[PDB]
Structures are given as structure tokens and as C-alpha cells.
Amino acid sequence: HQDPWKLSADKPDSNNYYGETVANGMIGIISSPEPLKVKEVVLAGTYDIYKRGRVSSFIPNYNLLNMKLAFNGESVQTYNINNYKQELDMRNGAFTGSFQFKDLATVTYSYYALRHLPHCIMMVVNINTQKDTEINVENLLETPSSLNNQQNYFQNITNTHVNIPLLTSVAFTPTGRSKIAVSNTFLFDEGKKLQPEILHRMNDADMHAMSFDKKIKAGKTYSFALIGSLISSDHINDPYNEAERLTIYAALEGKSRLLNRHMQEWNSLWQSDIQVEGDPQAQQDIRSMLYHLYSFTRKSTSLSPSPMGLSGLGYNGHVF
Amino acid sequence: HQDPWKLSADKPDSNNYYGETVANGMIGIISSPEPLKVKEVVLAGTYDIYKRGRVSSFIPNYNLLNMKLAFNGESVQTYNINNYKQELDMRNGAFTGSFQFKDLATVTYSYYALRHLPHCIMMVVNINTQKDTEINVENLLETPSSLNNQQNYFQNITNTHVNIPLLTSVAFTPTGRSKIAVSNTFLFDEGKKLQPEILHRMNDADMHAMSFDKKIKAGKTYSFALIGSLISSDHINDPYNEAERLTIYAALEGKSRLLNRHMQEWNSLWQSDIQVEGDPQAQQDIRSMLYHLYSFTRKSTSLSPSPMGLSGLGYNGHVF
Amino acid sequence: HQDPWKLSADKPDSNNYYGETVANGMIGIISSPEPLKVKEVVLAGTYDIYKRGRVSSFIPNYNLLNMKLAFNGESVQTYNINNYKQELDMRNGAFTGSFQFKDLATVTYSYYALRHLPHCIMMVVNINTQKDTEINVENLLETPSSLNNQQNYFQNITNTHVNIPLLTSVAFTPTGRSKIAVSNTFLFDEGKKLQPEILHRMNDADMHAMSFDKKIKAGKTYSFALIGSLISSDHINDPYNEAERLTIYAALEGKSRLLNRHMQEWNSLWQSDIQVEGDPQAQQDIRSMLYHLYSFTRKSTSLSPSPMGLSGLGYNGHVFWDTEIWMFPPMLLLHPEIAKSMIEYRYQRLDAARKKAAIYGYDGAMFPWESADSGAEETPVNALTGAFEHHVTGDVAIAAWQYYLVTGDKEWLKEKGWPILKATAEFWASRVEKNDKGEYEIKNVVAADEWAENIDNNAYTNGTAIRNLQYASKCATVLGVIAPKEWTLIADKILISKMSNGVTREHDSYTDQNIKQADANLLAYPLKLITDKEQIERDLKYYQTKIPQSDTPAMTQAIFSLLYSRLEDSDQAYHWFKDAYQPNLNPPFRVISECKGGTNPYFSTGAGGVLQAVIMGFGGLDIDAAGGIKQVKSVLPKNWKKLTITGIGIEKKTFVLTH
Ligand SMILES: OC[C@H]1O[C@@H](O)[C@H](O)[C@@H](O)[C@@H]1O
Ligand SMILES: OC[C@H]1O[C@@H](O)[C@H](O)[C@@H](O)[C@@H]1O
Ligand SMILES: OC[C@H]1O[C@@H](O)[C@H](O)[C@@H](O)[C@@H]1O
Ligand SMILES: OC[C@H]1O[C@@H](O)[C@H](O)[C@@H](O)[C@@H]1O
Ligand SMILES: OC[C@H]1O[C@@H](O)[C@H](O)[C@@H](O)[C@@H]1O
Ligand SMILES: OC[C@H]1O[C@@H](O)[C@H](O)[C@@H](O)[C@@H]1O
Prior knowledge:
With 320 residues, chain A is mainly beta. The first copy, chain A, has three helices and 19 strands. The relative contact order of chain A is 0.19. One beta-D-glucopyranose is lined by residues 383, 450-451, 516, 551 of chain C. Chain C: Keywords: Carbohydrate metabolism, Glycosidase, Hydrolase, Periplasm, Signal.
């Protein structure tokens, strides 16, 4: 556990677990011990009256990466997976989970607060089968209790080459001060004709979801990505249309171009570094300190970090 | 044009055309000279301050049956059809349009204000192709300028046997007095596995649509139905959920069971009739008078007709 | 842990803890493993759009009893107390916590949903010192995330005799549908001049608090009470002023008068009781079932319980046939005034049932699958039960007629029973379809076995239609009215079909599918359409193995138990009695979950079915078709030496059964 670039957790213990953050200075995503979920999402620059202090605060935002995975109708849970590991790669702010599901498949998921696109997130899911299986994949947009007056939308953006299914929610901070928009899509390798049909369900007041099925023969790899954009009226006058525009943009840029730009910006940040010989633990600890300051700041802005950066609502996100 | 049960119009002339009404005492649908469109929809019992008189009024409602039909990408236009005819069957309040698209196909469409289900409408579309063709079908829910604060939703209701795609809008009358909900679905003969994929577009502030493509082979008929439910807070405390529930109910009753109940109730109405020998024009005219009174009233209710029944906004829908 | 009146937990374990409820049929308070806190508070009759189902729901409310206690500036926590115990006294619905704080003091706290004051709660705190100490006491009013646009107030109500400090919050349900008000006060023994000064803090957007300090010398007892009132615009047009008025009222009534009235009403409820000799665990379990039904209902109202009562947001607080068929019958026998409130709920909502019938193309009254404030359909639209599970209309009719059979109240039958029975019969007469053979069908329903969707001639559904039409016809006769002759013609020809083995067929597409719950067996009990003991047994034999172990609710095995008791098969009756609820229990208070191994207590529906297995099965008690309560042949479990059931019927009869 003294990798100078990576922080690893074997079998996350939900009774004694403090999540790690990936961030780009605009969005922070804090990890959950649960597979394919995130605990908390924080957007910089969005403040309203909420809980502590009776003053402005950061607001818990859409846990926009939350996914449910089922194998032949069986729901993936902490309790029915094995060899479950989480890892933060401090070189590129990738948070990765990996596990085995019974005798069927190995799953890996990596998510990113894209370093070059302040309002865009991506998760890449890889499924490597040991037997024939059918996966059901659901992405959930649950409006957190911090927001109100939500609307849950779904539509297909199409042309001769693409069908971009957009799962969108718009909601308000407690006093109505800020309108938040989130828009997610699935990105498939196989192209418009062969990609899975996407269903939309609106079964709850505070949650809608998009889902698909996919048959995977034994000994195959199936990969897909979830891209989300998250933005508010503190950042843009029309967050609803800007969130959909951004997700369409990111979908047509594609995973490779997005990850390449992400990697280039993280490589540039790490051109300033601290190397310690003779103390592997100190080397990892100091890398974690640099990683968090780099994740919680952004060149070419007027952003300033709170005492807790984008790791949560510490000190209401205020600057001191 | 002296059929004692049917009113027919050859080649409707939009420069001199007064549409006919189908109604069940709750919803009136007034015909358009344009194929696969309706001019106006009126819901009984729903009043708000609007235009004439500075007093309560009926409100123009969602033109919920509006459909666009295309053959290999070419939209049906009054300029590219021939043998265009419209017919009102006064025996069952069926309004039918029929035309030939170029040399390719014959189209018939019949719609109904379902006599037994006050808040439910159905249109059945039949396409007979003389050559192999692909149809694109779009159902549009345009929020009329009479309504405000609309929301445009779409979802799939599923079980192992069905996928019911719901196109839903919710909006308000001018002062906010009444919440209106409309929910539409396509009903297919061929079953869940074989039915066309339904896409959803939300491109305008006041319009969203659901659509599909279907390949039809030379010498074959393809038939599908559009079912819609239209209800307000004047009729039910939760019109949004009741509209979706009604359309799901109607979809799982199916076209045959809905039309049989409709026909039974119309047959019962025509057990009281007036027959004139020696004057076919008087026979037809008197049948039209009975047809309109039967369409604009409803047994076992507390409804009373306006001077214009459900044919439009005449005298604001008031009872005199 | 086999006290017949008390459920106890030593050292509550927050990693494996399902709280118990105290309730008065209006407010439910669900316990926390944490000292001097409550997990959830639910107010009956308050519904808004919230989370599950996109339909009306109960709303988590103010945790109005939450208190922080500090000893010489040191905060009381789970981690720094010892000998921590919780206890529910089922005799008076008191939830009590007790613990030792280091070398300083013993603390006891008891809270109550006051039985006589629907909107009032009280907690009494006792501190017994082993050394000199100073306590800091804080009561917190945290607006839950379910509510919005809160306002946090504090004021002193004074006269020459009192200073009543009121901590008040007002807030709104998610869509603004309902305004909620809560108002709390501290009540002191020592009087105005000597009582502690109360401070008010407003440090957060969603929380304010009132607090005081008190010095207590070693070897002294210091007691005080927290009184709260919780009420909404669903209950009163001006909840803000009514909540403060109620708390002032309760403060000037005082703790003794409040607890005395509380005790008197609980004593009256327990005049109807079930006593088992030879099985202390069964005695405690059956007392818990009675306690929950008593806590989740209220005489002299139009309230009806959800499947989870006031134990939480289970099934969004909606009312289902869970009342009419599951919780209603045991209450009708023990406390007809509780059953009266349950059917009053439906009577009040008859116009909404008429509106549903008209919207869905039928006559009469079509009760909704799920009901809440208005009586309109509240079922989530993705559940086909809302559109197609029609037997609920017949279930309401059966409960209405049973209310008349047990009470003989002909005035009630004329004013309320007949309106229900006539309108629901008109619904069924419009719902059936006559076939070519002159039989009547009920096509395209969801069965009581809800896994059978959009099928024809469901056994239970068709049976409820038969009973509804028969009972409506009998009701007309009591009132000197000629029922439409069509009701009897239809009732006599509604299809109930058998398979080749002579077993009642669940529906027209049924062969040997697994089923979710009792359906064809309900024709034997409760409908009693099947009386032939060989037919009852053939149906039990075929269907009893059709209910899987997983994801099947507690709406089956209690019926099996009752039917085997009626067949005088003690071993099978007792097998199914235990299976009905023991695999569904959650620690540490043996609360009941919906399904085997479930974690969603408290499933009041399940308790209702089991209480029928005990009263109508082991006790042999039966609603006589001619009127009143009769006793049929029954058996006891081998290990039960005596079963005593008290307060039965309008004559309040005691029944004793032995081997
Ligand atoms: O969609 C993004 C891609 O667009 C193409 O037009 C370019 O050639 C690629 O370099 C680029 O990655
Ligand atoms: O969906 C409606 C259909 O349901 C079936 O179960 C019935 O047999 C049919 O007669 C009915 O038309
Ligand atoms: O405040 C309530 C008290 O009021 C007094 O006037 C009565 O004498 C007591 O019986 C009662 O308990
Ligand atoms: O308890 C509420 C509902 O739960 C469902 O599991 C059962 O199938 C229904 O019979 C019941 O009314
Ligand atoms: O609340 C929606 C539905 O939930 C299902 O779990 C129950 O089985 C139905 O009885 C209920 O109508
Ligand atoms: O067995 C449990 C299942 O029963 C079905 O009838 C309900 O519709 C589901 O909501 C439920 O999860």
C-alpha cells in the first residue's frame, strides 16, 4: 500500500470508510464504498442557504454516476461480489473499482472529473465474461433532498450517424437562488444500428433512470461509457440547454479525445512534483497532498478553494 | 351526399371548410381539412379566464391526435395526395380520412371520442402499400397558446409482455386555475419484441413528439393505433398520474375491447331515432341534429351543454 | 425476554436495529438506537408528492423529541454510557430508555403518543445523581429534508403563575400542499420563580433549539417533561396557532392529568385481549400484534391504517384491502368502534369511488386499489394493480356488511352501509360480461395473486363480486327495499371453475404457476363460498406449496393456519401459524417485516392476518351469516394449555379454549 502514485483499498468496509475525491476545480466526486455509486457531488461557485450556519453553503448535488448493474436479472451488491478493490490513480485523478461477480464476469469502472472540461464527468465500464451472460445497466438521476422543484426529462438527439439518448434533470437550490441542470448519456463502441435500445423510467418523484440490456458471450469484453454534464445558473444563464449541449459535445468528441485531453492536463500539473527517496510512505503522503491541491484548484479562473476543497460541504465551501 | 348515416367531404377545401365534431360529452374533437390533424380539442368542465368576455371560458386544449406520416422520408402533404376524402359515421361518431400517397400506398385513419371512457380518445391508422416502403410516424404534443408552464415527459411502462411508451404533457390554464394532463401511446399488433422502437424529441419549448419507422412490404397492410387520455384538476385531484394510468389501462384493454364498448354505447343511443321516408336530405339533417345532441350530452352525470356543445368555444362553454 | 407486556433491548446495536413505534392512531414515533432521540415521526392524514411512486405519500416529520444531554459540559453519546436498555411497555405504549453516565447519574426517559390527544406527545426525563453534577439540556427542532420554507420561532407565554417557553416550527410539504406546525415546551416541577431560564439558539437554516442548565446535588432526583404538539393544514385550517394553543393547553393540564387520561384509554383498549398459557413467546408475540393494531387505529374517526400503520412510509401510507380483509376483522370482533372508523374512511370516500367508476367506464362506486386523502386512485402508474386489481371494491362491500352483521346497527346500515353496498353492487353489475352459455365473466384483472396480471375470472375477484352482490341484496331486504333482481341472477352465475383434479382454478390461464399469496384459498376463508371440508383440503393441498419462500408477503400462511384449525388439524394449523410471522421478525423487538427475511417493518397487515388465525382459527370465532359472533370447531397448538379471548362482540363475551 506504498505505491507512490496510487492509493488502494481492498474490500471497502462501509462501517469505517472515508471516500476519496476526484475533482477538476469545478466538480468534486467523493467515492462510496458501494460498487458503481458515488457518495456526494459538489459544484464550485453554487451557494445557497442550507443547513449549517444559516448562511450560504455548497449544496450536495446529483450523484450523477450512480448505476445499477444486473447479471441475468441478479442485482450486483457489496454482498454478492468478491475480490472487490478501489484505487485512486493520483497521476490522472482516475478512481477505479474492480470486482468479480460469481462465475460470470470481472467488472472494472474508472471515473474522472475531466480536467479540461470543468462541467463534464465520465465513467468507463469494462465487463470481461467467464460465461455467457445478459447485463442490465441502469443510470439513475436521483434529485438529492438538498434540491427542489425538479423536472426529469429524456430525449433522443439523432442524425444519420448517432442516437445520443439524454437523461436530464433540472432542479433548484433551497431558496430558488440557483437552477442546476445535469445531462447524462451512454457512449457505445458499436455505433447507432447495433447499440442497445435505451429505456426511460420515471417511477418516483425524485428519481428517473435510463437503462439497457446487453447479451455478452463468454470470453468477451464489453465496454461503454457514461458522460455527464453538471452546471448551474451561477455558471451560465441557461444551464438546462448548456448541460444538454455539453453532453452532446462530449459524446461527439468521444472517449479517446476526452481522456487524451484529460491526461495531457494532468501530465502538465505533475511537471511540478516532490520526490522523496528512502521513505515510500512520505512519498505517497506528499503526492496525495499535491494531488488534492491540484484537484481543488484551477488555473485561468477566479476560483478559490474552501478549507475542504471539493471533498464535501466542510465550512460551507467558504473561502478563508 | 344523402347517406342517412354518413356525412362525406371529397377533397376538403381549407378556404371554405367548417370541421365536424366527434364527442362523448366530455371531450370534443373538431376536424381539420389537413390529413392526420385535428383543428381544436375542447374538454368539458374546465373553465378559466381567457379571451372573450373577461369571464370563465372553455380553453382550446391539446390537439392530441396530430400526426406526421412520411414515406421514405417524404412527408404526406395536401399537394402530394389524391382521392382525399373525409367521412363522419353518425352511427358510431367515427371521423375517417382516406387518401392515396402518390402511387405507393392508401392510408385510412378513423378517430373516436370513446363513448364509454369520458377522458379517452383513439385513432386507428391503416396503410396499404402497392410497393415496398418505409413509413416514419410522428405524434406531436404541441402545448396550445391557451396553456402555460407546460412540462413535456416521455417514459416506458414495461413488464415481461408489454412496452407502453407514454408521451405526456402537463400544463396550466391562463390564471393557473386548472392543471391539464394529456398522455398518448402507440398500440401495435405485432407484440413487444417486434414493435418499432419509439424515439422522443423535445426540440421546442411548446412541442415534443414520439416517432417510429416501420418497413412495410408490397401488397401488405400495416395498422396501429394512437390512444390518448385528456383530463384536468376539474375532474380529478391528480390529473398527471390519472392521465398516464388511463392510457396504460386503455392500452392493456386493447383496440378491439375499446371499440366494442364504444359501439355498444352508440347502438344504445340510436335505439331512440327519427326515420323520415320521402326526403333523404331531411333524414340526413335530422340524424345530424340527434348525433350532435347525443355527442354533446352524457347520461349518469351532472353535465349540461353550452349552446355550441363541444364543437368549440361558442359562448365560452357557458350553460344557458 | 418473554415478559408478556414488555419488549426489552439491552445495548441497542445500531448495525442491526429496527425501531419500535408508539402511536395514538394520529402520530407515530419510531425509536432510534441513540439515547434521547427518535428515528422517524409520521403524521396520519398528511400526504404530498414525495419520493416513491410519483404519487401522494406520508412525509417524514419533525423528530420533535430529539434532545442533547450534557453532564458537566460532557455530551451524552452511545459510546460513553453503560447499562443502556430500551423497553416498550405494550400496556400503555410507553417507550423507555435507561442508562448510567460514568460515576455521575442514572437517566430514564419515557415517551408517549398521548392516547386521548391525537396531536400531543410527551417525554418525561428522570436524572438520579450519584455525584454533584450540572446538566445541560437541549431540545432540537430540525426541519427534515422532506419539508421546505421553514420558520423557527420562540416565545414566552406568561401570567402571574407560569412561564411556558414555546419552541415552534412551521414548514411545508414538498409541493406546498400541507403546512405543518410543531410546538414544544419544557414542563418543570419547581414552578415559575425557580424553573431554569430557557435560551433559544437559531444557528442553522434547518435547526433551532431551546436549552437550559440545572445544578443537581449528589443523591437527588431531578425530573422534567418535554410536551410537543404536531398538526397540519390537513387537520385544522390554522396549524401554527393550533399547535401553540395545544402545547399551552397540555402544559396547564400538566403531566399527571395527561398520563392519567393516557393510561385510562390504554386500559380500555386492553379490556379486549388474548391470553395464552403454556407458550410465553406466543403470548408476547400476540400482545405485540394487538398493541400495533391498537396503536395504528383510532375509534370515533374516519382514519384507516396503511399496511405499515404509523411505523414509517411503507406503501406511501396508502390504504388498501389490507384494512378491509386483514386488519379490520380482528378489530371488528375485539373493538367494533375501531372497525367503524375503518369503514367510515371508505364511506367518506364514496363520492371519489363513484368518480373513479365513471372515469373507467363503469357504474356505481369503484374503490381505488390505493387510497389516501381524497379517495381517488393513488397507485403508482407503473403498478398495473391501480388500473386492473378490482377486487378492492368487493372487499369494501364485505367489510361494510360484516360491520352490520357484528353490531346489528340498522341505523348505520341505512345511513352508511347501504350507500356502500348499493353503489359497489352497481359497479359489479356493470363490470361483468355475460357469455353465450349465460355465465358471467370478469375479464382482464390483476389477481389477488398479483403475479397473475391481465387474466380472466380470478377466483378471489369473482368470489368478492358474488359476495358483494349477495350482501347488497340482503342489505336491501333488511331496509325493506327490493334489490335489482339482476344482482342475484349475476351472483348465481359468476364463473368459479375447477381444474381436472377438482381444485379451484385461480384464473382461466392457471395450471401450476407459483403464486404470490393466497387467492383461491380465500374462497374458503374469509369468503366462505367454499364450505365443503374435502374441497377446502384439496385446495390447500394444491396451493400451499405454490407460494415461494422469497419476496412473498405475510398474506397467506395465517389463512392456511386458520383453515387447518377449522379442519381440526392442530399440527398443520400450528406449523402455518409460526411460518406466518416468525421468519419475518426483525431485532431487537421482534417487529414484523412484509416478507420472510425482510427489513421493512412494521407490516400491520401481517399482524392482522395472524390475529385472525388466533381468534377465528384457534378460537373458532366466526361472523355468523345471520348476525353476531358464533364459535365453530377448532383445535389449539399441542403446547397451548389455554387460549382466553376477551371483549368479543357487542356483548363483550370471553371465550376459553383448552385441549
Ligand atoms: O470526434 C473526435 C475525432 O474527430 C475526428 O474528426 C478527428 O480526426 C479525430 O482526431 C478526433 O478524435
Ligand atoms: O386485454 C383485454 C382482453 O383480456 C383477455 O384476458 C380477455 O379474454 C379478452 O376478452 C379481453 O379482450
Ligand atoms: O391542571 C390540571 C388540574 O387542575 C386542577 O384545577 C384540578 O383540581 C386537578 O384535578 C387537575 O389535574
Ligand atoms: O400490502 C400492500 C400490498 O402488497 C402487495 O405485496 C400484495 O400483493 C397486496 O395484496 C397488498 O395489498
Ligand atoms: O404501490 C404499488 C404496488 O406495489 C407493489 O409492490 C404491490 O404488490 C402492489 O399491490 C402495489 O399496488
Ligand atoms: O414478489 C414481490 C413483487 O411482487 C409483485 O407483484 C410486485 O409488483 C413487485 O412490486 C414486488 O417486488
